[PDB]
Write an enzyme that holds these catalytic residues in place. Structure first.
Site, PDB file in Angstrom:
ATOM      1  N   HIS A  59       0.858  -1.364   0.250  1.00 23.03           N
ATOM      2  CA  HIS A  59      -0.014   0.134  -0.095  1.00 23.03           C
ATOM      3  C   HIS A  59       0.809   1.316   0.008  1.00 23.03           C
ATOM      4  O   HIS A  59       0.576   2.286   0.640  1.00 23.03           O
ATOM      5  CB  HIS A  59      -0.980   0.037   1.097  1.00 23.03           C
ATOM      6  CG  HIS A  59      -2.044  -1.097   1.099  1.00 23.03           C
ATOM      7  ND1 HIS A  59      -3.082  -1.342   2.203  1.00 23.03           N
ATOM      8  CD2 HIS A  59      -2.095  -2.036   0.193  1.00 23.03           C
ATOM      9  CE1 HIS A  59      -3.690  -2.292   1.854  1.00 23.03           C
ATOM     10  NE2 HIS A  59      -3.125  -2.861   0.719  1.00 23.03           N
TER      11      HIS A  59
ATOM     12  N   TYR B  18       1.921  -5.933   6.868  1.00 24.00           N
ATOM     13  CA  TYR B  18       2.063  -6.829   5.597  1.00 24.00           C
ATOM     14  C   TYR B  18       3.529  -7.304   5.420  1.00 24.00           C
ATOM     15  O   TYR B  18       3.563  -8.764   5.029  1.00 24.00           O
ATOM     16  CB  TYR B  18       1.570  -5.934   4.227  1.00 24.00           C
ATOM     17  CG  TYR B  18       0.237  -5.227   4.123  1.00 24.00           C
ATOM     18  CD1 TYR B  18      -0.494  -6.543   3.929  1.00 24.00           C
ATOM     19  CD2 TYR B  18      -0.279  -4.273   4.316  1.00 24.00           C
ATOM     20  CE1 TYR B  18      -1.971  -6.309   3.592  1.00 24.00           C
ATOM     21  CE2 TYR B  18      -1.513  -3.846   4.360  1.00 24.00           C
ATOM     22  CZ  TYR B  18      -2.362  -5.098   4.027  1.00 24.00           C
ATOM     23  OH  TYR B  18      -3.793  -4.646   3.783  1.00 24.00           O
TER      24      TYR B  18
END
Ligand SMILES: [Mg+2]
Length: 966
Positions: free
Chosen positions: A450, A457
């Site tokens: 992102h 993540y």
């Protein structure tokens, strides 16, 4: 099926389904003379019967059903997303047919009478067909006839049809296959191949078979997102509940399999009560393939030969059912989008069952099937390295599944070519610096998803990427050392910025649910043991620390004695997220800013709603252990008062993101972040600038906020603080933590405060200690409020009210309507006696530090305890200073004058890129006073001064040790 037409305005969204589990089931059906329609209960999709259609070539049957076919616009308005009316059905062939089934739509049709489409019949097993009535035919409001015409060029045949359906579906997901052409196609994988090829040799074949065994070992000896079930009684009970039976001349009967995403075509929330009851008998594929995996694991570990045989037959019968249900090569099943969620453990089960599939003659079908459905993942599975290959979600959810697929390839030379190419693909993905904000590792050790540094993540990606390298280790398929090196950097970095959770500022959209290095523990062992010279002592020592294992335990794990890592000490700059970490004893301080390239916060529709100040020059102090136990409690947390931030205290309705869905608010300039000196000292420079015109953001809110971090202390200073309202409600938070029986004490000026509620006001010369043992000496401020109070707040996901008791302290900047400022000092090992000594040193002409400049161009802090000077050049400037004379770019410079040497570091925290462009180095010219001689920093004496040339790449500091010239 109802008497109502398809797409009836009473409920447009209510599907009409021909499942035949009602009174008078062939009411709506007529056949020409050359077709015979029966119900058969020998196979079905919904209910226990399907339509057996016996036919001579060119013959038709007809469904008599009125269709009020809506526009895509009307469908879309009714649902709330881009939609189309879909016609869909299931058909079964016991034998392949060399021709086409024609489906025709019209008004009062017969065999001899608008638009239609073709289904190729050259297959066996169940297939699904689904077409957009508006977009996939080769339709006026009078349509009442759907005619099914058997092929003209085939003398006779037989087809089973079930679950003929009219529904509103997502307009992305009617996919073309070997049966039906739609406007939409997911093209097949086309594998890349690297030269030179490795030969099929006994060595290279054994290495392939060792990699498969090593994968089996990981899955049989806890995975996130795997519902593990080791009780055989339970696996048998779940299996029997599928009611699968082998049929006489091929196929199965059993409960219908459907993915979590495929269900959308029914619009389950809008089904009539009759259909929904039938739909509720379907099996969700994710559950089914999890069962297949849990069975495969039990089979591998099973010592009883009878139980072992049973577990194998259960797995092979589930495989047969899965294929006959149409999960085969060339069968789109209308869509299988988000395939991994439904199938990840099928991939893995095939490793454990590889010899059973070989013996049963199922390996080729299961390989062709998995490869086909894998075409969704073509961008990674083709194994051509690209800017997008460093995807951190791939490393988490797909990388092992990808390897499993390649290992299932039947041909030896092709399997070796695939795994060789995979080794190259993973080496590139773990080595390359992706351009702009693309996912992957970065050269400062940050790891992006992102479009920013994202532990939430990266942590799962580190675990699985480490595991992959370890699976391939010491073979001709081993990952290149460049990939191992880059992953080491990212994982050592994560050890530094976690304690063992990442701070609030690194929590992404999950404040107060930080990722923990404890979840990544096994990756440190995998990476340690997959070093070119194993074990890597640094990674091994981290694995032992994080997993709470002793030196005594080390010899059996690593094959030599390794001391568990002590917590890292000093200062580390991570401008990939415009942060830095100061470490002293068991404490970590997360110093965090933001800029053009570093979003302040990720805020979603139901995540991090109050996160506006997540990166507002925060300095969250965390001792090793649970942050919740240290009073970082979501309930009653004042989202305005993030530790170290300068904020406008807003009501939550105004602090809430002004976007109902997603906002990732980037800053107004490239420059803000940290730098480091000697691995021990740090500085943050935060230029607090708001957007010219974003709702709820004061466009005139400004501050300059610098921190100098050394040893047991941090010096915080701020200048040029303003708002649209003369600094009304403008505040700098010293700390905030929950009050508990273990966190019950504050010290103010040598007095223990335990009362709740409590308020007081402090000024310059006053000090406090919070319940976590941090001392705050106020060195410049007119008004510091201290509060112990009941607080009302709201939780970051759904804004539901919360409450709790908190100790906090903040500077009130409203006392200076224009260009407010502050200074204070934190001691990480504070006791009332030592804070008394620090206060005396402060009163002795400030023995602690000196601010040499504090204006919009430069902040300069001399730390007299450490003997370090930090220079925040918010603008290029000529200055008056003993060491530094001029800097030609916004930069952070640091100096330390040791005995016979001057150490100078410089950087710009500006990463010098965009969301699209690769970061390129910034050349920074630092002039220093006097004549010096010597690191890759260049220096040149020029007159009475010395020019240093620093190369700042991705905000990575550089330093040089200088000695004076006579
Ligand atoms: Mg049926």
């Amino acid at each position: 099926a109802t008497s109502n037409p398809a797409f009836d305005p009473k409920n447009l969204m209510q599907s009409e389904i021909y499942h035949f589990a009602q009174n008078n089931p062939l009411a709506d059906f007529s056949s020409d003379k050359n077709s015979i329609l029966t119900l058969s209960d020998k196979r079905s999709i919904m209910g226990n019967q399907s339509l057996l259609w016996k036919w001579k070539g060119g013959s038709s049957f007809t469904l008599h059903k009125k269709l009020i076919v809506p526009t895509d616009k009307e469908a879309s308005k009714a649902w709330g997303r881009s939609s189309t009316p879909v016609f869909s059905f299931w058909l079964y062939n016991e034998k392949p047919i060399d021709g086409y089934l024609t489906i025709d739509f019209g008004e009062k049709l017969i065999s001899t009478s608008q638009a239609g489409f073709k289904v190729k019949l050259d297959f066996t097993g169940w297939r699904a067909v689904g077409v957009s009535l508006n977009n996939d035919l080769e339709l006026g409001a009078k349509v009442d006839s759907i005619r099914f015409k058997a092929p003209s060029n085939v003398s006779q045949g037989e087809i089973y049809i079930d679950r003929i359906m009219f529904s509103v579906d997502d307009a992305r997901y009617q996919w073309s296959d070997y049966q039906v052409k739609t406007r939409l196609s997911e093209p097949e994988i086309q594998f890349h191949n690297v030269k030179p090829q490795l030969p099929v040799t006994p060595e290279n074949l054994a290495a392939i078979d060792l990699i498969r065994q090593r994968l089996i070992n990981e899955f049989v000896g806890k995975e996130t997102n795997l519902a593990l079930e080791e009780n055989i009684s339970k696996l048998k009970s779940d299996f029997d509940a599928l009611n699968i039976h082998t049929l006489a001349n091929g196929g199965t009967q059993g409960r219908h399999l459907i993915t979590d995403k495929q269900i959308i075509i029914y619009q389950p929330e809008n089904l009539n009560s009759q259909d929904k009851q039938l739909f509720d008998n379907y099996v969700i594929l994710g559950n089914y393939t999890t069962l297949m995996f849990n069975i495969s694991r039990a089979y591998v570990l099973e010592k009883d030969p009878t139980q072992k045989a049973q577990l194998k037959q259960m797995y092979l019968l589930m495989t047969k059912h899965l294929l006959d249900q149409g999960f085969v090569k060339g069968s789109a099943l209308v869509t299988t989008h988000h395939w991994g969620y439904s199938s990840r453990w099928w991939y893995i089960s095939t490793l454990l069952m590889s010899d059973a599939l070989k013996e049963a003659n199922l390996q080729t079908q299961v390989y062709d099937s998995l490869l086909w459905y894998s075409r969704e993942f073509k961008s990674s599975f083709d194994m051509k390295v690209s800017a997008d290959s460093s995807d951190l979600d791939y490393f988490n959810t797909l990388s092992r599944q990808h390897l499993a697929l390649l290992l299932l390839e039947p041909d030896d030379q092709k399997r070796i070519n695939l795994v060789n190419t995979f080794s190259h693909y993973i080496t590139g993905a773990l080595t390359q610096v992706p351009p702009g904000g693309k996912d992957g590792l970065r050269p400062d050790g940050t790891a992006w998803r992102h479009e920013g540094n994202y532990p939430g993540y990266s942590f799962p990606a580190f675990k699985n990427a480490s595991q992959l390298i370890y699976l391939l280790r010491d073979t001709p398929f081993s990952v290149g050392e460049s990939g191992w090196n880059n992953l080491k950097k990212a994982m050592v970095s994560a050890w530094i910025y976690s304690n063992p959770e990442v701070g609030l500022p690194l929590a992404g959209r999950h404040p107060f649910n930080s990722p923990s290095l404890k979840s990544v523990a096994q990756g440190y062992y995998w990476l340690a043991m997959s070093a070119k010279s194993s074990p890597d002592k640094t990674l091994a020592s981290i694995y032992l620390a994080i997993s709470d294992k002793t030196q005594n335990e080390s010899t059996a794990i690593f094959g030599e004695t390794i001391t568990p890592a002590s917590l890292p000490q000093g200062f580390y700059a991570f401008n990939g997220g415009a942060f830095g970490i100061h470490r002293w004893q068991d404490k970590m301080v997360t110093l965090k800013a933001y800029n053009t390239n570093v979003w302040s916060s990720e805020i979603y529709n139901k995540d991090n709603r109050y996160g506006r100040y997540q990166s507002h020059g925060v300095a969250q102090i965390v001792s090793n252990g649970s942050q919740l136990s240290q009073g970082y409690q979501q309930e009653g947390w004042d989202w305005n008062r993030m530790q170290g931030a300068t904020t406008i205290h807003l009501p939550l309705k105004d602090l809430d993101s002004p976007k109902p869905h997603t906002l990732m608010q980037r800053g107004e300039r490239g420059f803000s972040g940290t730098s480091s000196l000697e691995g021990q000292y740090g500085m943050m420079a935060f230029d607090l600038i708001y957007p010219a015109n974003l709702e709820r953001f004061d466009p005139n809110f400004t501050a300059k906020k610098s921190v100098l971090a050394a040893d047991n202390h941090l010096i915080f200073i701020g200048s040029n603080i303003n708002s649209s309202d003369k600094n009304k409600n403008v505040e700098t938070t010293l700390f905030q933590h929950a009050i508990t029986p273990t966190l019950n004490t504050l010290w103010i000026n040598g007095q223990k405060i335990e009362n709740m509620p409590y308020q007081t006001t402090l000024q310059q010369g006053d000090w406090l200690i919070d319940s976590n043992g941090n001392g705050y000496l106020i060195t410049q401020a007119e008004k510091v409020n201290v509060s112990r109070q009941h607080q009302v707040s709201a939780e970051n996901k759904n804004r539901q009210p919360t409450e709790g008791n908190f100790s906090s302290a903040w500077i009130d900047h409203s006392t200076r309507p224009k260009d407010a400022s502050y200074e204070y000092m934190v001691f990480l090992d504070a006791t009332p006696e030592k804070m008394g000594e620090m206060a005396q040193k402060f009163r002795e002409n400030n023995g602690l530090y000196q601010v040499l400049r504090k204006d919009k161009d430069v902040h300069i802090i001399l730390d007299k305890l450490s003997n370090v000077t930090g220079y925040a050049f918010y603008q290029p400037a000529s200055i008056e200073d003993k060491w530094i004379k001029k800097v030609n770019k916004p930069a952070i410079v640091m100096t330390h004058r040791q005995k016979d040497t001057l150490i100078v570091s410089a950087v710009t925290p500006d990463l010098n890129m965009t969301r699209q462009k690769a970061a390129t180095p910034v050349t920074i010219n630092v002039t220093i006073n006097g004549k010096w001689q010597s690191s890759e920093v260049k220096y040149q004496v020029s007159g009475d001064n010395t020019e240093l040339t620093f190369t700042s790449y991705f905000g990575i500091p550089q330093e040089i040790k200088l000695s004076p010239l006579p």
